[PDB]
Each structure stands twice: as structure tokens, then as C-alpha cells.
């Protein structure tokens, strides 16, 4: 096209953890993503 060379990065991917303090205490569930940023959630 114009030969403006380009870089490739494996697009943000990662595991998910869950923040939950026990069914007895409550049921609110929060989510954690590790190998990514909030910009591309």
C-alpha cells in the first residue's frame, strides 16, 4: 500500500478470576481480567 511498516501484538487476552466472599455472606460477584487492560474490556 505505502510500505509504512506495522507491528503485530497478540490482541489482549487473559484469564478471569472471580471475587466472591462466600454464598453465606452474600452473592455479589466481581470479575478480574489479568492479561488485558480496561481499555479493551
Amino acid at each position: 500500500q505505502t510500505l509504512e511498516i506495522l507491528d503485530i501484538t497478540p490482541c489482549s487476552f487473559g484469564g478471569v478470576s472471580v471475587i466472591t466472599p462466600g454464598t453465606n455472606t452474600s452473592n455479589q460477584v466481581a470479575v478480574l481480567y489479568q492479561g488485558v487492560n480496561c481499555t479493551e474490556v
Binding site: 501484538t9 497478540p10 489482549s12 487476552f13 484469564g15 489479568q34 492479561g35
Partner: peptide, 23 residues
């Protein structure tokens, strides 16, 4: 840290719970 030298297609390093700062 400087003595030693410096997202891999399905295999990842996880962060430590204990960052170098907290360490």
C-alpha cells in the same frame, strides 16, 4: 535487577501477587 537481561500465543506469565515494590 540490571545484571539480568530482559502474551505468548496461548501461554502467559502471571503477575506475582507480590510486586517488586512490595517485595
Amino acid at each position: 535487577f540490571n545484571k539480568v537481561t530482559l502474551k505468548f500465543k496461548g501461554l502467559t506469565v502471571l503477575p506475582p501477587l507480590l510486586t517488586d515494590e512490595m517485595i
